[PDB]
Design a binder for these strands. Structure first.
Ligand SMILES: [Mg+2]
Ligand SMILES: [Mg+2]
Ligand SMILES: [Mg+2]
Ligand SMILES: [Mg+2]
Ligand SMILES: [Mg+2]
Ligand SMILES: [Mg+2]
Ligand SMILES: [Mg+2]
Ligand SMILES: [Mg+2]
Ligand SMILES: [Mg+2]
Ligand SMILES: [Mg+2]
Ligand SMILES: [Mg+2]
Ligand SMILES: [Mg+2]
Ligand SMILES: [Mg+2]
Ligand SMILES: [Mg+2]
Ligand SMILES: [Mg+2]
Lengths: 191, 195, 109, 139
RNA sequence: GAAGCUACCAUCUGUGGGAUUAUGACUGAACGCCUCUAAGUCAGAAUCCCGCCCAGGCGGAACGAUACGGCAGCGCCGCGGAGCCUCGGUUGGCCUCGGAUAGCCGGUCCGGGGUCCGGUGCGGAGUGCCCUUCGUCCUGGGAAACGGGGCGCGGCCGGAAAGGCGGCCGCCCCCUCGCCCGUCACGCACCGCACGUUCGUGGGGAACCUGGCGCUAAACCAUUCGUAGACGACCUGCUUC
RNA sequence: UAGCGACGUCGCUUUUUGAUCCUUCGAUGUCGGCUCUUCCUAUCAUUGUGAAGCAGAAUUCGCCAAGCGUUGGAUUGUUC
RNA sequence: GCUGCGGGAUGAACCGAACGCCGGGUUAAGGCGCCCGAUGCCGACGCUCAUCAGACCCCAGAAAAGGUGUUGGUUGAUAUA
RNA sequence: GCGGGUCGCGCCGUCGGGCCCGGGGGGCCACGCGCGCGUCCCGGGACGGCGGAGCGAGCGCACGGGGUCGGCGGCGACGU
């Protein structure tokens, strides 16, 4: 109905800094830096506050789908702020059948090697994203921890793991086996 | 005489309409950077329509009959063929006058390229609608020459930077000369009569 | 010394969609791109300059290989600023996409 | 980014239409496309003109919402738009385009001879400056 | 039963990359939550396209040889003279990549950040430059130390996608009216008339006389050959050791 | 409502048959088989998938999908 | 049928309009991105994203039914108790 | 009390009667003064005819005038 401006409000803490040269957002903090492009959306990104760091995501007339789109920018900015302050940690318990799954890492946590795979002999190799690391958890049976900064990269690596572990040509209600995502959280907790 | 046109950021049908109208009058027009001509719609739809165009072929002999070019310059040349009366010696002479190129040739590196405002993506299309690249479509179907054309394009972009730095240096020098004194006697005439 | 004639391109004949009328010709003249701009050229005289290997010439000093079918501007045509013209002899139809001089005489300067 | 915007109380140029080259002032926006404009001293009558028909400027005025012609004229004469509008480069650009439209052949002859003299002096000075730059960079 | 043809009747070989459909997903609003989607990202196959494999276009490259003999004939440079054919314009623009909810210019600091300008663009194609210069002579004001064209010489390659003009240095036959402002006098003033002034020392074809540098062959037929053949066509040999 | 679906109702096809006579009566050679090339999908199998009253195996229903296969025979002139 | 002409790309019946040979002006039916004459008006409002979009009487294709895909509209029901 | 016709008074209206009897700038294709022929009106205006009375005549010219003329002007050879 050609609605006049919709503005989303983002507070940015003093631990991190934001910089925009246009629709490109560059957020640099304690846990590295992270930059993304919002080129294909055409929504104004303004900021204010002398060491107060108030971001505003403003869109004029638009349409209903574009008023739906203007909140997505605010939510991904919140995701980037959480990833640069705390980071993302996905904990995946290996829900395993009669045959256990042997999960190791090869290339410093960037190559997950899967073995014994419901009795299938084929050793499986999954290459992760540049910017996410992998580990096998301690004090817990067959838990796989993926740690990173970007939620899209970490969750796409977890999606690649849970789709590489997939029961094929069977009733998949039976044979409940695969590496599924158990817990989603941050690296630095209690915040 | 010659009309050297950019292709970066133009639309296929609009640019073909303006070129096919201006080539019948005698102005020798050449569309350069044909791999960057945008096409409206979805890219899956554009390659589906081009796949249907490939499917259209003579079944008794595919050679004697429909020819299906994969290079984007020849795609645009077929687009202008389908608009000019090419079966007569008016559109045939117009297609002889028309020249098309992928990348940029070395004379057209030196000669200045024109940009048609009536055929631009930004002027004609809504900015929240999908689009495609004709060079991307050509590399996806048939035309295996993106890696050579892009390399030569980066080479001529480096040449254009190393020329533009010298041109901007000379412009700074001539504006220092204009900043200097004892030229204003003619400027008393010129500022009154349209500096 | 210097060109005294404005540039116009012979575009075609007065026609419908099927049939033509060769008595009136169409000129896309440069500079004019508007109905309000094709007003000053009403009354100009045009000239199509072509070549032939025999010798039928003007008295301008020496004989040459130049032949001209004369004519003049009749009226305007379209919103794009096209110019109708009735020449004294009809067009050879080779002149499509070619140039016809528009000289700046009897108009009302 | 977005330094200008339509506003209750903003002067705006008119490029296309029957009132071309005449400043108007936006009073209120009717519905998304047209605004009730008014002219106190720019010889244009109070009417509704489209936004794509007008052209936005930078100067603002303190109009009340839907005020009279009298209050529009008082805010215009308080803000002094005419002298401050003559004292900018944009009106000089429009005035130069009008003077080029109002040239004559004798004026073009004077412009061409001054053009030749200035370009000869500029060419000699650019040659002298690049010679001095080479003489400076040679040690 | 030799040679040769032939047999899944003997033997050998048949090969990978991309975008993606269906589908399963990631982030994430619409719609506080949810969601594979609305903008965005991932995996994805006998499908599709290309690779590999065939014949290569009224398609283009690089290189060799380019006509002896006794008169000959033929190329490159710069030449003056005439003449037949063909058709088109009457100055050329020697260039930033990229965006359009953004971008241009100038500039201390370590290609980036801060700062200063301009912005319906004037560091602009509603533009810039030799330019509307018919020419000559005298005489003066302003600008001008590069001189200003080159039958010029020598070095550099600038540029490889379809390249030939431009820049620097040292001299040369010379020019200080190579341009704007003023004075002077003339050149066809062809007495009212068109196709006039142009990148033209225009494109190619046959010959005429002169200067210098050079060039001294190759196909096709005939014959032979079989790895080839309906006929053509294809691969081949020919020295006096 | 996995798979089915009566009583009713809405469509597609010319792979059957029917209806008309519009072309053909100074002729368009009339069945089947053999051989041979191409195309379609309303998919039998193979490749990638979803759903079952899918535990496995074996089946059924669907989607993208015509690239490649889709027999040897006794009978009948056979189409069947 | 016995009938040309301008549109419907092509047409026996459709839409205008009926025909001696021509010049000028105008118009119907129709159209003005290129073929192919004409919107190259700084045309106005709003709808539509369609992995089978859509594009003008006869005319050369389509229904019952369904959609939290978007746009209006009607009847209602909640909410500072 | 609600309707139909008529009469009498007042208020308007660049209204109509060339509006008139008598008084205190512009336009009109509108004209024999002497005096005497009838109608109308208050010595004067309109009309048929006569008392005045269209008296002298087509002289020349321009014609937005029964379908244009110039009493306007140029230019070229032995291969056009
Ligand atoms: Mg099973
Ligand atoms: Mg999907
Ligand atoms: Mg019949
Ligand atoms: Mg029949
Ligand atoms: Mg027969
Ligand atoms: Mg037959
Ligand atoms: Mg097949
Ligand atoms: Mg009959
Ligand atoms: Mg009849
Ligand atoms: Mg017709
Ligand atoms: Mg039709
Ligand atoms: Mg007519
Ligand atoms: Mg047209
Ligand atoms: Mg039919
Ligand atoms: Mg609905």
């Amino acid at each position: 109905m050609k609605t006049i401006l919709s503005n989303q409000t983002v507070d940015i803490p003093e631990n991190v800094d934001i910089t925009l040269k246009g629709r490109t957002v560059i957020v640099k903090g304690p846990r590295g830096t992270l930059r993304r492009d919002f080129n294909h959306i055409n929504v104004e990104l303004s900021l204010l506050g002398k060491k107060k760091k108030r971001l505003r995501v403003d869109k004029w007339w638009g349409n209903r789908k574009e008023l739906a789109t203007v909140r997505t920018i605010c939510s991904h900015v919140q995701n980037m702020i959480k990833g640069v302050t705390l980071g993302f940690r996905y904990k995946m318990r290996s829900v395993y059948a009669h045959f256990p799954i042997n999960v190791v890492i090869q290339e410093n946590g960037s190559l997950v090697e899967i073995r014994n795979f419901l009795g299938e002999k084929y050793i499986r190799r999954v290459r992760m994203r540049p910017g996410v690391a992998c580990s096998v958890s301690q004090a817990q049976k067959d838990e796989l921890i993926l740690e990173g900064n970007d939620i899209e990269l970490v969750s796409n690596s977890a999606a690649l793991i849970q789709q590489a572990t997939t029961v094929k040509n069977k009733d998949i209600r039976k044979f409940l086996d695969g590496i599924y995502v158990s817990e989603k959280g941050t690296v630095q907790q209690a915040d | 005489q010659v009309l050297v046109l950019d292709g970066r950021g133009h639309l296929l049908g609009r640019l073909a309409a303006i070129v096919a109208k201006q080539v019948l009058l005698g102005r020798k027009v050449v569309v350069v950077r044909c791999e960057g001509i945008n096409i409206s719609g979805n890219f899956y739809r554009n390659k589906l329509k081009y796949l249907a165009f490939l499917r259209k072929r003579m079944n008794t002999n595919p050679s004697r009959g429909p020819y299906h070019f994969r290079a984007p310059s020849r795609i645009f040349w077929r687009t202008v063929r389908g608009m000019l009366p090419h079966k007569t010696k008016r559109g045939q002479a117009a297609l002889d006058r028309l020249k098309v190129f992928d990348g940029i040739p070395p004379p057209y590196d030196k000669k200045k390229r024109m940009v048609v405002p009536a055929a631009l993506k930004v002027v004609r299309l809504k900015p929240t609608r999908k689009f495609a690249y004709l060079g991307r479509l050509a590399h996806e179907v048939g035309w295996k020459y993106q890696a050579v054309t892009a390399t030569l394009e980066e080479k001529r972009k480096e040449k254009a930077k190393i020329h533009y730095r010298k041109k901007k240096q000379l412009m700074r020098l001539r504006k220092q000369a204009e900043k200097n004194v004892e030229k204003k006697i003619d400027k008393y005439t010129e500022v009154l009569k349209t500096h | 010394s210097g060109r005294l004639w404005s540039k116009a391109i012979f575009a075609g004949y007065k026609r419908g969609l099927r049939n033509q009328r060769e008595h009136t010709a169409l000129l896309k003249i440069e500079g004019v791109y508007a109905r309000d701009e094709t007003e000053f050229y009403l009354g100009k005289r045009c000239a199509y300059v072509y070549k032939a290997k025999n010798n039928t010439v003007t008295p301008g000093g020496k004989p040459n290989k130049t032949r001209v079918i004369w004519g003049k501007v009749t009226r305007a045509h379209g919103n794009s600023g096209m110019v109708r013209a009735k020449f004294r002899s009809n067009l050879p139809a080779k002149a499509i996409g070619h140039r016809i001089r528009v000289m700046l005489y009897p108009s009302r300067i | 980014v977005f330094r200008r915007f339509v506003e209750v109380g903003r002067v705006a140029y008119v490029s296309f239409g029957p009132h071309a080259g005449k400043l108007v002032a936006i009073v209120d926006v009717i519905d998304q496309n047209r605004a009730l404009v008014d002219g106190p001293c720019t010889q244009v009558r109070r009417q509704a003109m489209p936004f794509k028909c007008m052209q936005l400027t930078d100067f603002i005025l303190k109009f009340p919402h839907s005020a009279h012609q009298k209050y529009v004229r008082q805010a215009w004469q308080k803000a002094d738009i005419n002298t401050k509008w003559a004292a900018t480069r944009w009106a000089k650009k429009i005035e130069a385009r009008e003077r080029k439209a109002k040239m004559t052949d004798f004026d073009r002859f004077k412009v061409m001879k001054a053009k030749k003299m200035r370009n000869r002096i500029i060419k000699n000075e650019v040659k002298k400056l690049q010679k001095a730059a080479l003489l400076k960079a040679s040690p």
